[PDB]
Symmetry: C5
């Protein structure tokens, strides 16, 4: 039964060098706050118990089944599900005892996206591989990451990748940290351009005379169009506890402005139908509405330039598993 | 074959200490009444049959396969599906016989959400781990829960977590109870603000003269917009047998009010087209409609402050499995 | 190899007592005609070959792996997929040879819903557990069902549950029959109330004068709203070969009535624009339309009270597998 | 190792009689061109090596595990995925060596639907079970199909089922061919009735005077409604390379007719606003439009009665695997 | 343990001839940039260690389990998931040692679609089978591809298929390259025809007199219809980092043109309501708008004829795994 036990390096723990290849990051679901990726793990260690004399066996390398020798059972905390593409992998051992294991896996880890600057949000995602069955006094990890992404024409671009070993740990683990940036133009063209166009159309329609029947229908049809667009936006975005995207607030403000414009138009038209004072009030409100639209644009730009997504760290991140 | 039998503690049943780490609760589907979570179970017990003399074996801890020793087969009643991230886990046994087993799993349990106060609903979810293959006279559980959630910026926040052992049980089991509260602003901004804005717009449009063609089209377009919004809301919410969300009732009342306003406007305009009495009736109806809108808002607020979701307990909850 | 053979009861077949616990019925997909449920099967039988003397073995009960002894391989015909939550279950055997096996499974069986009275449809669902590997002369089943549903606040309520053993069978099987009733208010509030409100609005708008431009736009906007509502309804319901829901027919009739009203309004307005006769025709058509709407409501109520869903039995139900 | 080898029938290949029970065909996804079904395969053959003397063993039938004897490994070419409901099935062998194997499986095969006559499309679906590990000189199949469908109230009805053995084959295989016919009324009521109603409404609205403001809005609102309906239809149907459904062409023609009517109305109203000649042109265009609508209906009916879906056979169907 | 080791060809590496049958390519998800396919791999090699004398064993071919002999463990880098339809396949070995292995698998690989010319996009997809457990000095692959696609009536047509062995490789691998072309008419009829029709309708409605109330509502209703169509298009297409489809840009330009037309109409109508100069400005703008629409059509045609999708190669494609 000793063949499946972890090799002894002596006083120091056994060293396992892990090479991580990020084949692709294909799914980035902000609604579920999940990131799906494909990884290749090449784990190399030394097991002198498996060394054999070259004279007896002419082969310079042999393949052993996954359960015939000690292999580090890696577990990912953030991964919703892990699909190992090799159900029964094999370990390659040479005459000097160096064991190499290749594992191809697909995971859907949990990533805490910072959606404050949607659709240009920048987030940090982490994949923490833990060897729960072992202890830090027996197992040590050296993690290297190679950026071998095969799909680059995606909405989210992985530009920074690195590996680290959290110090002062009880469970031996290594963390692969990558950075996601959104470069998709679908959201912008889909929502922002129609929203700004509708706002400009409402501002222009404010110039129609107060006693024109063609104005109320115009305003209400624009209001319905913006309601549909706002519903599409809000259903296309998730809601956070504290740090929500600024786009939902901006669209809410614009929708309130459009509702205020429609309400003012209808109220003043009704009062007029009952230069007259309502027409002067309409002109003053039109000037104030144009000024308010410009001020709202400038204020939102300033907020975007000086916004802070200051959500507190999660209990798992504040106290990582297997620390101290 | 005795190596896989449950260890004997004597007259008292064997004690297994279970430490539960809630890594994340990522999916909360009110439509399916399901809650998906990731858990790490650390089960520690004593098996003196596995103890070995330290002189013979220099190792202070060994790893055994899942099927080479007795391990408690845990089953979750509420879980729609259980995905164990380790198909063949290993148990760590030291020289004194203390066996530790780490199991990482992902489940989609069934949670009875109290959706009465949507979108601020507060619910209790339960995960009951049962050892169906054993009996209470042989197995005992001590359950501890650690709140190590890695994703805190979610729509639903897990704020209270605890563990318990239901007394007077035949099947040894332990229950992990957590509390979910909804803090998502997506539903509010998506539906309530547009609904209130449309209601206010309809009230304001009630001030238009009865003999204005611009009024009927205005009312009908607002009615169509609110129909679309109501359809979106009802398709965005599930239906319960007795305790339904108050939002669907509130939106139904508002939709009926808008339909009544449109019907009154059209009927009075038609009768006028056939101060005249219909205009006086329109003014009286406008005053009554404003008063009724305010009264409906106050009544709904009072109902929300004094509503009771008094759904009877389910047969499974009333009579838990493996009791008496 | 005899340890995995079915125990011999003698001339009579072996008796296996099955206790079925219905933990939850969570998904009821009328579109796919599927019902998903979670079940716990407790199968108890007698295997005297496994009995041991209490003097030799102090244990009063032992656990054996799933493949170390004969266990009935149960197969569900209606189940689209079966997920056994215990991949390698264990059987508990006492000193007297009584073997007990607990199996927790999740299935998505096929249920023939009677959607004639949607959204108040009442249907019978069946789960037929077959022991295909055995014969009726060797295996017999006693099935008991316990209603331990943990989720009661669902759209569909399971109120009647029972078990039966189909007589004159070649393959030993037992059938669990449950009854589903729909109590969801989502469909009603979503569709019926807006549909009736739109119909009443169209009837009221029929009172507008024939030579009013505000009438045609009103009618067409209501027609568009009802077209959207009808599309939502038909996409929210499945289509059967013969016994379709009465709601689709009712909405089709109402849509045809609205189209007829709009067509009459437009035709008469055009003819008038080319007391005049078209106005008298419009008044007569309005009276006939109100009478027809009331008659349609009464006729649909009568049909609902006296409708028969007389779909012929399926070939599988007419000739169950393993009969005669 | 000879116990897992295929039994020798002599010069002639071994004969395996396969009985196929089609429990249900639940999913028919025209968008993915897939058909999901549940099947029970009863494979009976003769293995004289497993025969035993009745005097030694009193049992008249024994059960052996799936890997303890030779069993034909069946593979389905068209199946996207195969879910065997029995992971480790058992084979029943009597004293005379007759081995019977029952396999319950669920598959999602690829079916080439002939969607030319949607929603009344008639298609042929095929499930080809191949024994890739064997050769035709060693294995032979006799396939029988029993129509035991448990769900008959579906959109698609399976009315013809048969089995065949493709002659001149290298890989022993048997093909189960079924015929699907669509009887769903959801598509018809959802799309065709509203489309015809909107077309009739547009024809009737063509009678409005050219100098009426109520006509342009009427035409444009009908155009928007038909645009929504056409979008729903095209998103509810898939696109083929050559043989597309005639419904998409019919709806495209109707949409072009509605656009032409709206364009003519607007152009003539504008020219008139700048008996007058535009009114005479409008009357002539109305007559021509009614005649063209009737002619389009008749032409589409004739095309439907004399349409040929002449898509060439796929390379897989033209040259089946394991032929010659 | 030597029975599972790779056979030795001598100084030269072992040669494995791989025959690839592409049964079907059923899913092409541009949103996820994925291509799903079904493949049959026939791997033939020589293992003289398994040869046996024909005199001792009369059988000319035997079947061995997957784990009883050396088989190349193939891994696909681009595949999101691999479903092997045979969990425990068998290898056929004749008396001369020629081992043949048949593997039926279904994969969802990652394909970098060139969506510049949507919906007539042409893309290259690759499936790279890697033998990670072996080295190039021990294993060599000869790959042959047979186009046996069973479903030809799909949106995407596979017209070119080939196999290659990347030279100067450390990990033995073979790449199957296929070409996808889109022939679906669903996108064209769904979006382009309604978009062009709406643009033509807006151009025609520009001819309405500036002082007509029927013009503003017409323009705004067309604007709402095109907003809905544009939203449908953008939600029906994915967004790339650099090389986006030209259709989204074209629809954005058309939407901006429609917004400009509506804004000009409303502004000029308002200024007129406060030959007059606004009417002359409206006529000049109408001429300029027609000229601009024609110029935009010609410019987009020229761009389509002279567009370059020059996205840089992904890091995985630039540096393939196991090279040098
Ligand atoms: C046993 O422990 C020693 C020290 O922990 C390891 O030696 C280290 O190897 C790494 C190579 O990545 C070097 O960076 C360090 O400088 C080395 N430290 C010392 C003190 O030598 C050694 O690799 C371990 N051996 C095994 C088989 O794990
Ligand atoms: C055997 O049974 C005894 C009593 O049931 C267990 O002793 C208890 O251990 C817990 C530690 O969590 C204490 O809280 C109790 O106070 C103890 N009770 C007594 C009477 O000592 C003991 O742990 C069990 N031993 C094993 C191996 O399970
Ligand atoms: C062997 O067969 C006999 C008869 O079929 C079984 O005895 C029956 O047990 C049930 C208990 O549920 C009783 O309801 C019947 O009245 C009994 N019938 C008779 C004639 O005794 C017996 O249980 C079977 N034994 C085993 C181990 O299966
Ligand atoms: C061995 O081969 C012979 C001939 O191929 C098989 O005999 C046939 O069995 C079928 C029964 O379905 C009959 O329809 C044929 O008429 C028979 N042909 C002859 C020449 O007899 C025989 O079944 C095979 N035996 C086994 C065990 O496979
Ligand atoms: C051992 O190596 C030699 C050379 O690499 C292989 O011989 C080649 O076989 C292919 C057949 O596809 C021919 O195209 C080459 O021309 C051959 N080259 C030479 C030098 O003969 C041989 O097939 C290998 N044997 C095994 C069992 O793998
Ligand atoms: C993401 O990582 C970078 C450095 O790697 C750091 O500067 C930044 O603060 C991180 N952002 C968040 C939300 O953690
Ligand atoms: C939820 O739990 C708290 C205490 O833990 C309790 O007060 C409350 O009544 C529970 N609510 C429901 C619906 O069970
Ligand atoms: C359902 O079951 C009840 C009795 O259990 C029976 O009266 C009724 O006819 C059944 N309905 C159908 C559609 O089978
Ligand atoms: C389908 O099968 C019938 C006979 O079984 C045949 O007449 C018909 O041509 C087939 N249709 C297609 C598209 O293969
Ligand atoms: C696709 O393959 C063909 C030749 O096989 C090549 O000419 C073309 O440049 C390739 N296109 C891309 C985007 O790689
Ligand atoms: Zn080495
Ligand atoms: Zn930013
Ligand atoms: Zn210990
Ligand atoms: Zn509350
Ligand atoms: Zn007993
Ligand atoms: Zn009923
Ligand atoms: Zn027999
Ligand atoms: Zn036909
Ligand atoms: Zn050979
Ligand atoms: Zn091109």
């Amino acid at each position: 039964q000793e063949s499946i036990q972890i090799p002894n390096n002596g006083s120091a723990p056994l060293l396992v060098d892990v090479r991580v290849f990020v084949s692709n990051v294909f799914n980035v679901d902000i609604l579920r706050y999940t990131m799906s990726s494909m990884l290749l793990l090449r784990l190399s260690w030394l097991d002198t118990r498996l060394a054999w004399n070259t004279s007896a066996h002419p082969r310079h390398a042999i393949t052993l089944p996954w359960e015939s020798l000690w292999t580090p059972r890696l577990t990912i905390l953030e991964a919703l599900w892990v699909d190992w593409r090799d159900q029964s992998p094999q370990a390659r051992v040479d005459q000097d005892g160096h064991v190499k294991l290749n594992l191809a896996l697909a995971t859907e880890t949990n990533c805490n996206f910072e959606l404050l600057h949607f659709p240009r949000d920048h987030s940090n995602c982490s994949l923490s591989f833990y060897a729960l069955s072992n202890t830090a006094m027996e197992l040590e990890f050296q993690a290297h990451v190679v950026n071998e992404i095969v799909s680059v024409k995606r909405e989210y671009v992985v530009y920074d990748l690195k590996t680290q070993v959290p110090p002062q740990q009880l469970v031996p683990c290594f963390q692969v940290t990558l950075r996601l940036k959104n470069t998709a133009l679908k959201s912008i063209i889909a929502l922002l351009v129609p929203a700004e166009a509708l706002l400009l159309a409402d501002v222009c329609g404010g110039l129609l005379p107060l006693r024109a029947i063609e104005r109320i229908g115009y305003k209400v049809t624009l209001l319905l169009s913006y309601l549909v667009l706002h519903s599409s936006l809000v259903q296309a975005l998730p809601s956070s506890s504290s740090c929500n995207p600024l786009l939902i607030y901006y669209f809410t403000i614009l929708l309130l402005l459009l509702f205020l414009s429609t309400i003012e138009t209808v109220l003043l038209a009704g009062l007029l139908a009952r230069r007259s004072w309502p027409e002067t009030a309409d002109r003053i409100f039109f000037l104030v509405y144009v000024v308010g639209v410009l001020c709202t644009q400038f204020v939102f730009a300033g907020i975007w330039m000086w916004a802070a997504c200051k959500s507190d760290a999660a209990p798992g991140e504040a106290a990582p598993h297997g620390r101290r």
